[PDB]
């Protein structure tokens, strides 16, 4: 996923910052297995 490329590399901060220039997302984090960039 976005930034979250697996449990060996969780870029919570490319995840938080794909979502966070897009109005609608205040942030995000690696949710599922370090692969899914879950944003809110």
PDB file of C-alpha atoms in Angstrom:
ATOM      1  CA  UNK A   1       0.000   0.000   0.000  1.00  0.00           C
ATOM      2  CA  UNK A   2       0.890   3.680   0.217  1.00  0.00           C
ATOM      3  CA  UNK A   3       4.037   3.749   2.332  1.00  0.00           C
ATOM      4  CA  UNK A   4       2.991   0.527   3.983  1.00  0.00           C
ATOM      5  CA  UNK A   5       5.046  -1.984   2.031  1.00  0.00           C
ATOM      6  CA  UNK A   6       4.891  -4.793   4.548  1.00  0.00           C
ATOM      7  CA  UNK A   7       5.896  -5.526   8.175  1.00  0.00           C
ATOM      8  CA  UNK A   8       9.519  -4.933   7.178  1.00  0.00           C
ATOM      9  CA  UNK A   9       8.771  -1.398   5.987  1.00  0.00           C
ATOM     10  CA  UNK A  10       5.786   0.487   7.338  1.00  0.00           C
ATOM     11  CA  UNK A  11       6.034   4.102   6.211  1.00  0.00           C
ATOM     12  CA  UNK A  12       3.156   5.286   8.383  1.00  0.00           C
ATOM     13  CA  UNK A  13       4.575   8.729   7.874  1.00  0.00           C
ATOM     14  CA  UNK A  14       4.259   8.166   3.113  1.00  0.00           C
ATOM     15  CA  UNK A  15       0.890   6.768   4.225  1.00  0.00           C
ATOM     16  CA  UNK A  16      -0.139   9.637   6.511  1.00  0.00           C
ATOM     17  CA  UNK A  17       1.511  12.117   4.209  1.00  0.00           C
ATOM     18  CA  UNK A  18      -0.404  10.299   0.439  1.00  0.00           C
ATOM     19  CA  UNK A  19      -3.604  10.919   2.361  1.00  0.00           C
ATOM     20  CA  UNK A  20      -2.799  14.026   4.378  1.00  0.00           C
ATOM     21  CA  UNK A  21      -2.598  16.765   0.887  1.00  0.00           C
ATOM     22  CA  UNK A  22      -6.021  15.313   0.100  1.00  0.00           C
ATOM     23  CA  UNK A  23      -9.005  17.082   1.637  1.00  0.00           C
ATOM     24  CA  UNK A  24     -10.986  14.445   3.448  1.00  0.00           C
ATOM     25  CA  UNK A  25      -8.105  12.693   5.155  1.00  0.00           C
ATOM     26  CA  UNK A  26      -6.679  14.025   8.395  1.00  0.00           C
ATOM     27  CA  UNK A  27      -4.131  11.238   8.508  1.00  0.00           C
ATOM     28  CA  UNK A  28      -3.479   7.536   8.126  1.00  0.00           C
ATOM     29  CA  UNK A  29      -1.503   4.538   9.351  1.00  0.00           C
ATOM     30  CA  UNK A  30      -0.469   1.015   8.403  1.00  0.00           C
ATOM     31  CA  UNK A  31      -3.379  -1.185   9.450  1.00  0.00           C
ATOM     32  CA  UNK A  32      -3.467  -4.632   7.842  1.00  0.00           C
ATOM     33  CA  UNK A  33      -0.166  -6.496   8.107  1.00  0.00           C
ATOM     34  CA  UNK A  34       1.804  -3.327   7.470  1.00  0.00           C
ATOM     35  CA  UNK A  35       0.501  -3.333   3.899  1.00  0.00           C
ATOM     36  CA  UNK A  36      -2.750  -1.381   4.069  1.00  0.00           C
ATOM     37  CA  UNK A  37      -2.557   2.390   4.369  1.00  0.00           C
ATOM     38  CA  UNK A  38      -5.694   3.086   6.397  1.00  0.00           C
ATOM     39  CA  UNK A  39      -6.600   6.749   6.321  1.00  0.00           C
ATOM     40  CA  UNK A  40      -9.298   8.759   8.050  1.00  0.00           C
TER      41      UNK A  40
END
